[PDB]
Design an enzyme around this catalytic site. Sequence first.
Site, PDB file in Angstrom:
ATOM      1  N   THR C   1       0.831  -1.227   0.000  1.00 32.25           N
ATOM      2  CA  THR C   1       0.000   0.000   0.000  1.00 32.25           C
ATOM      3  C   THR C   1       0.843   1.244   0.000  1.00 32.25           C
ATOM      4  O   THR C   1       1.872   1.305   0.658  1.00 32.25           O
ATOM      5  CB  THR C   1      -0.859   0.073   1.236  1.00 32.25           C
ATOM      6  OG1 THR C   1      -1.713  -1.064   1.269  1.00 32.25           O
ATOM      7  CG2 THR C   1      -1.696   1.326   1.233  1.00 32.25           C
ATOM      8  N   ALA C  49      -7.335  -2.454   7.447  1.00 28.87           N
ATOM      9  CA  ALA C  49      -8.447  -2.023   6.616  1.00 28.87           C
ATOM     10  C   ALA C  49      -9.701  -1.699   7.420  1.00 28.87           C
ATOM     11  O   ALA C  49     -10.297  -0.640   7.246  1.00 28.87           O
ATOM     12  CB  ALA C  49      -8.758  -3.092   5.600  1.00 28.87           C
TER      13      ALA C  49
END
Lengths: 233, 125, 212, 204, 222, 205, 205, 198, 198, 222
Positions: C1, C49
């Site tokens: 990410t 997340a």
Amino acid sequence: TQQPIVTGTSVISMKYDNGVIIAADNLGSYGSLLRFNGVERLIPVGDNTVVGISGDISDMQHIERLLKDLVTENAYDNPLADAEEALEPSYIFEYLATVMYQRRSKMNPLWNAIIVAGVQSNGDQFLRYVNLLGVTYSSPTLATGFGAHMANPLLRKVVDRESDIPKTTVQVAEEAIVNAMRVLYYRDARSSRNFSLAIIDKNTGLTFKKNLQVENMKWDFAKDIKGYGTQKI
Amino acid sequence: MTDRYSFSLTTFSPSGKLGQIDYALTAVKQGVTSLGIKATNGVVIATEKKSSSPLAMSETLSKVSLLTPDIGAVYSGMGPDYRVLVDKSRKVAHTSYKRIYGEYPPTKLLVSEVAKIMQEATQSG
Amino acid sequence: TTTLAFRFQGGIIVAVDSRATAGNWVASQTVKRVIEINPFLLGTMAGGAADCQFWETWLGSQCRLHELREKERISVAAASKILSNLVYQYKGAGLSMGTMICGYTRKEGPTIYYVDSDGTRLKGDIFCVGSGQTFAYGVLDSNYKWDLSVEDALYLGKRSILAAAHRDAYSGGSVNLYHVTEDGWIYHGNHDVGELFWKVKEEEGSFNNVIG
Amino acid sequence: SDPSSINGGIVVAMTGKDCVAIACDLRLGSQSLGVSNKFEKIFHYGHVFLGITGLATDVTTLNEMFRYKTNLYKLKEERAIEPETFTQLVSSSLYERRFGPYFVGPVVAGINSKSGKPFIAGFDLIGCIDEAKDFIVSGTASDQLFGMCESLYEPNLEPEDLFETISQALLNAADRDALSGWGAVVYIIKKDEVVKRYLKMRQD
Amino acid sequence: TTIVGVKFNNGVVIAADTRSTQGPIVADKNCAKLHRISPKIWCAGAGTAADTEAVTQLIGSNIELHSLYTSREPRVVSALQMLKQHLFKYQGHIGAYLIVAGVDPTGSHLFSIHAHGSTDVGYYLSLGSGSLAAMAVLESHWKQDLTKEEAIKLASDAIQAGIWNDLGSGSNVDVCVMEIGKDAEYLRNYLTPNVREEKQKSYKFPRGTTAVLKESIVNICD
Amino acid sequence: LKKGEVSLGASIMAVTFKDGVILGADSRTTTGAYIANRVTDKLTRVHDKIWCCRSGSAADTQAIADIVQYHLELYTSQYGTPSTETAASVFKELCYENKDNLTAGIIVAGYDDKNKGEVYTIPLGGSVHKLPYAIAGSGSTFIYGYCDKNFRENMSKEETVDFIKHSLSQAIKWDGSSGGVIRMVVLTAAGVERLIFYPDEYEQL
Amino acid sequence: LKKGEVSLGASIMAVTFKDGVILGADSRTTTGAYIANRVTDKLTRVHDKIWCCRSGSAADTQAIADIVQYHLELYTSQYGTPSTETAASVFKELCYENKDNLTAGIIVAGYDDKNKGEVYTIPLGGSVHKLPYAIAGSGSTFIYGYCDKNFRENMSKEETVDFIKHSLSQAIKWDGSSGGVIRMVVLTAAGVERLIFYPDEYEQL
Amino acid sequence: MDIILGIRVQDSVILASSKAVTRGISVLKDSDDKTRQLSPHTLMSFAGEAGDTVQFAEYIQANIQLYSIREDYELSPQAVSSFVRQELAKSIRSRRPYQVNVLIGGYDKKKNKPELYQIDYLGTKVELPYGAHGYSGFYTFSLLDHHYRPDMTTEEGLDLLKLCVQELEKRMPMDFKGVIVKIVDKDGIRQVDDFQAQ
Amino acid sequence: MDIILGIRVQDSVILASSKAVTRGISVLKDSDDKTRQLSPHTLMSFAGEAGDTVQFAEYIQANIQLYSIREDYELSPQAVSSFVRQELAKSIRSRRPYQVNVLIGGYDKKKNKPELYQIDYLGTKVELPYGAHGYSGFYTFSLLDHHYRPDMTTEEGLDLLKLCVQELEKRMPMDFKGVIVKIVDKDGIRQVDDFQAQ
Amino acid sequence: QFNPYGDNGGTILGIAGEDFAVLAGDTRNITDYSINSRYEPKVFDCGDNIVMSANGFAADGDALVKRFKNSVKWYHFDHNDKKLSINSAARNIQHLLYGKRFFPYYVHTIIAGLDEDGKGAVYSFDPVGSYEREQCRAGGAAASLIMPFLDNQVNFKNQYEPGTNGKVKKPLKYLSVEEVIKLVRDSFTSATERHIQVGDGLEILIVTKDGVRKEFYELKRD
Ligand SMILES: [Mg+2]
Ligand SMILES: [Mg+2]
Ligand SMILES: [Mg+2]
Ligand SMILES: [Mg+2]
Ligand SMILES: [Mg+2]
Ligand SMILES: [Mg+2]
Ligand SMILES: [Mg+2]
Ligand SMILES: [Mg+2]
């Protein structure tokens, strides 16, 4: 957060055209010491359910007390306690499965594997498993512990799928159960020769057979085995 | 005690002759005859069974030996030397080939392996 | 990410990739890493997340409540601190998040606050967070100028993510861009890294060592 | 810590109608860092191809070892090693290091020069042989490739079609693996000719 | 894995399934677990595949050399003692669990060998993760003085018990029959009860689907 | 004991009597709770009239017995028939010298014309103890009391077979690691007799 | 068992007979190999004719018996004499509900006029088992065979004292954690009789 | 870990290597040269474990210097690197493995092209336009990927390394005390004494 | 850990605190002010664990500002520090202890003297001429012990802090990106914007 | 020590079509190497045209599904019989899941249905509540074997138009329920071939404006 002490081994069961059969030996082991030989691990609830329990015996004894209480409490202000509003196998099961999962979620499980075998009021056979983790499943045959490994393969040759249930008679089913119990005495080091078997039929009701013994065993061939390879005498 | 013979027993003589090899070849000359003939679809190796007595059971002494299922050997010379060469050849067929490639060696290579065993007996101590 | 947010002349540029991995398994190539807290505030997802998604949506609620009570738009300083203070209450329990709270208010101007699960709350002009952060920073640092046009800024953010998506195994998928102005944020698209890599290469002449 | 997951990479081989195919990706990385996009994992000794996935230092070491061994073989035997034979050589070479193995997953693909029968084989790190008639997968995206291959594969495809199949099996398997990709190469192998094609794919 | 050995009136039969696994993945849907040690001595192996093939081929090799040296047909007690002393030497590190059966000049034999070096003799034996399902069958239908036909079915059924009930076993059934006066008969894929149904669609791609960057010819010959 | 290897569990004993000595054992081997072999032979011959009862690791005891059998065959070829004391010593040497890697509790029993019957127990450490009778195996704990109460020196064959039979049935009764059939080997001047008793007989005594 | 706490080890048993039930026990407590007390009393009174044999942790079993004695004293004050089954249930409730922190193997034995003698054994997990007789304690393993072979229902007092005397001496013989004197408590309609047997007697039986 | 970067331009290979040597709590030296000339046209930079680093580098140099003399010839950079890779790959399953990562920049007088090889402690060799070891690449590769061109001059390479070192000095946590830069070309190996400010 | 130094001269207290904030592999900020004004004549600098640091600082600030308003008076530096010590000494046996080290530099308008308090995360308070937390003192104390005099001017302390910062920049491994310096005296708290080079 | 979690295997798959959505799952329930049931439904109709499957540790899957069905019951009660939209069901599930953030429901949940515009919808969740709306999602044991296939066959990834030098991507036409079911069956038979935990049966729940319809196909039992 615990560990089992006195334990019960396999509980096997299978459903047939008009009912279900369930069996479990009568031993309570303490590790490798086959300590107690008169333990009944099949618990009849009313006249239409038998709960077979393997695992920790002090916990089984607790589940017994709980079941007797459910019966007492269901009779309360229940004019139909011995009729329309009697305990059904599905009620007893769901109750137990609820307790088991709650106890695992508090990190203090009832160290058991349980099979609830019975016949619903409309005739449907009921066979469902629940263990120390709250896991539940149903199948034409169900066995716990060791029996899952050796009994299921045998019982499944009789009832391999749902369609095979209506083609199976009590005679056939009982024969298979009795043979599985023999195989388990052969290969499970924690088994006992003495067992109990219960049949719950939609017509003849609950037949509970106590003090059964594995018979017709083959041990004669052992006379011809000597050494472990080359020994001739 | 101990094999202190770490030197060659076969050495070059002034004429460039390797004495022990020439003498071994003489030993081979006094041995029974053996032959081999190669055809289009086969090979035949043959020899005579010079039984050294009629009380001996000639079948218990094979002069024609199988080395691999597709290779055979025969000789002329000192029988015991051949017997040990056969054992060593059957073994090397396995150690330097079957245990590596999963198949038996081709004739020339097995031949090449026996030959090496013989050469070393010509130079080792 | 890889997520980034930087401050400039015309607002804030927020750019992020969209890959999620569980071990070596690419779980998704379409993850939304920018949480639209409300029409004026953006938050970037990095770390857990669920943690980011949950607490930032909740933030979106606490901000709405503030506006109902005080009749005035919430400042990025207060909004970010709501999140930051919450995260600190749970310190040591295991939350995992690295996020940028971005907004542009009248009182503050474009504002970016980096907030993480350790309790850190920092105001700044440029932040990159994620497994690909180091790659994004290289590009960002050498081309960042306060006077960038809104078109060049969007490109820089986009390019920086590309740089990270190429090298970082854990970044890729596509780039999502956002431009934050005082009147709210404007979404500037979803760009597949597959297609974007080839375009940038021919047009810019970069990634020479890559054959295409 | 898992030597088979440090560098990344995949290889797949398939058999067709009088042909075989072996393909691989081109990535070499160090955990999350992509390091090289030119790391081919398919090598060939004569007409026998060997793809190897795993720890890159071992992949390189094994290629060098097999070149060495196949070179000597050719000299002594005066003929090039066959796929069936090489397969046995790989297996025996891997098991020789049974308790300190090379962290690799070899794959052999080739066509026997005498019989013309297409051949492919796979091995675990200690030498166990898997001689399949359909396909062999190896690498960090082996599950993915198994999924792709089990669905995409159908027997007896022509060189032109196998290409598409193996390519798609490879390409889509790699796109779901973080440690694979950065390029791909496919070899379509026939009795007489071998064609090598580099595929265009995402570079993330 | 499920492997069995069943002794019959004038011979012995061994059988095994054909699924090879690496964790929960089926690496090989049709591997061979029946190894030939010598023409009439076969061994079924379970555990580490490389180990069962390796220990089998090594002993088989040495057994072949022992036979040529002694001019006699190999004996099962030899493969047995050699296999077990090797396995014991490695303290369990060579994960080979075997069912060695065969016929030799002294008769028909059946033994089992566990990875640590212990052997057992029996009339019916099973090993593998599917060992319990197979033994449940062997314990239910075995009887003394079985005929060749009855033993093949019994051993075959035991393997089926494992195929169906053990996730560690599957695919087909391999059998090898070793009869006292005859050649050993290896029946590879004696039973094939798990054929995949035809797929619902064909995934053949139209040519040109894949994007190619560069194409070139590989030079094979020197 | 190594993780997962076959265990002998066992109820084994050897008892000397007037005519000689009798060895007895159950026939169960286990891998956890699974009975790997329900009809094992734990009575192993290392010489014509020198046998042993094995307990502990199945692999270890087989390996050891295989080596003692060899050492005694070679002894015999060179110096004649070995004494039980010599057989025990060879067993001891192996058990003691390799105590770190073996799990073997071995009872050696044998018959000689000069010495009559003899029993030697070689416990886990490798020490050797000569006794009138010896019990070992995991099932032995349960019959320490029974055996000490009922054993008498110079019993008859009939009586000894009975003693061994009752003891082991009790041992088998309580120990899960013991079961199967009760095997016995009688060693006397007359020869070697093999006996076997099935469950149906011993279970209800 | 907590690190370093006093252990009961023990050889304890309770046997029902014609006239009632008899409890027996050795008298040794230990901390490692040191015998902390060589003359303890493991036969504890929780009610006039309801006693228990304690084993496991000395601390735990005393705590539990002390609490049971209280529960039964209060029960008595309100509802009259408690049945042995009731005394067992109280012991069980404590042993089971607190299984994680206790180490108590308790044998409950009592005499009632309606039920004659009764024996309940509460093993480590807190499960309850009613039996004709029970044995427990670390020394119990050694007499499973002896006891199963020699117990008969409806024995006479004289016979039961002898059975308990022989069993425990065997248990004491083999178990290092058992020893001392053998104590018995005879519970019948006639009252409560305390018997004690010394080493010079029981050792050579 | 130290900083080791290399960039192969059109006619030369530039190796930039950090100057610090840190032992625990204190920086011991700020002028360390983490490089050894293996042959007149081959240079190797290295980073890794304390003593292993120099011991390995000096062992390789000695070995290459011996070959040059026995043969009266200078091995190609590709040959030197393969030799280096084999040595590293030997230690990986050794009693005590060398933990050294190296960059080999050499100018091949025969092919007339500069070459850079990157080999990590495991023996993982790869030939590249630019490379680095440890974390160095994490900050610099995005810059190199962006600005690199195969036809760069030596000056264009130096300007790029400078940018790379600037990003390292801005975002990397430890003070590596600058880098010593060396250029390897047809005329040999020279140390660029002008990099602290260019 | 970050750099926190404090020096008490004749009519003021100077606090120097590093400007870097490093999170893992990267330096996130190079302009951080690790200080909070507790009262118009009291400042506290802090260093330690990631979030605890500012949370603790702002809590102490909030509490002192509340005392100031309830009472219309400014607590002495000695009072502010004992309050800070007890707060730190409370957390040490807490569920999750604050891991914050602080320096409180204040000018006592009643005694007309500057004071510096050094308090570690355990609540260990000591009043000193100069102090530091963590490793900072290891490098700087030999310099302070040497050049320190009680009658120094503000400019003399600043030159001494500069020498200190130089030693730290020479021998300390991490790049703390410089220091922000603040002076506390009779007229309040001012930030010395001239230190990057003086 | 007690481990509160288990792994019951299984694999589920949800695919959203233009005006429909499917949620399929195998019917096998396992424990280590044993099959617990060959038919234990894992995908359920929760009312309101929403289908759900919480795959992983079956006890948690059961609990979560029971809690959600109950959430639907109370939503009606508390909000005058209002129909719970799929996006609302999703958000609500996030809260159920995140409610156990520090002792998670070890499951990968997927719910399928139709959104407010009547278009197909699938939402997938983390064991702790992260969720996103997706096109297709495989979950569980063989998720890794199915996903790459769907990417290729549902989203047409890596496929290009024959002749365009890989410069024009294959156009994204949308599949009918009939073609999607083909993909689902193929995804499953392929997974069954290579994953030991996948097999026995495949039950597909299909959702359209007309309601929830069920289909069932057998899978290999080895
Ligand atoms: Mg893999
Ligand atoms: Mg990839
Ligand atoms: Mg990437
Ligand atoms: Mg038993
Ligand atoms: Mg004692
Ligand atoms: Mg709604
Ligand atoms: Mg499957
Ligand atoms: Mg199966």
